[PDB]
């Protein structure tokens, strides 16, 4: 949310948030979900800079 700035994760069961953070200033060109060889440990963000 907020033009790339804020990131949240929820639980999908009760509505119970588990963690929120904030990012730098950008435009949020795109988002992806990366895994290295057999798991999905990481997520990726691209904000035009």
């Amino acid at each position: 949310s907020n033009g790339g700035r804020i990131m949240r994760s929820w639980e999908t069961n009760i509505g119970g948030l588990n963690w929120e953070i904030t990012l730098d200033s950008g435009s949020f060109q795109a988002l992806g979900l990366v895994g290295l060889q057999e798991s999905v440990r990481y997520i990726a963000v691209l904000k035009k800079t």
């Binding site: 700035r5 804020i6 009760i14 509505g15 119970g16 948030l17 588990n18 929120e20 904030t22």
Partner: protein, 97 residues
């Protein structure tokens, strides 16, 4: 800047009512309680609930929340640290005969 908080109920196993909290003053949500990315000043926060009561708190952010009384701007009752609220049972909106 930001606002850390705990919001607890005595024995009511919090998680359920986390589905209906939205803290106002800037809006935040529950896990515990955090409000990111605000400026510094004299803000009065409260923990909204439709089936519970929570007394507001007047932060004057370095963090110090003293009291809300609305009559005498200059007053210090030095509440220690963040937004303990005591969950004063269910509010009585119903009236007997």
């Amino acid at each position: 800047f930001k606002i850390e908080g705990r919001a607890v109920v005595p024995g009511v196993k919090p998680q359920d009512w986390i589905s209906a909290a939205r803290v106002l003053v800037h809006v935040g949500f529950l896990k515990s309680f955090v409000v990111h990315d605000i400026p510094s000043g004299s803000y009065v926060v409260e923990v909204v609930s439709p089936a519970y009561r929570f007394d507001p708190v007047r932060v004057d952010i370095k963090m110090r929340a003293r009291y809300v009384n609305y009559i005498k701007t200059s007053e210090v009752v030095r509440l220690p640290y963040p937004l303990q609220m005591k969950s004063s049972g269910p509010p009585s909106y119903f009236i007997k005969r």
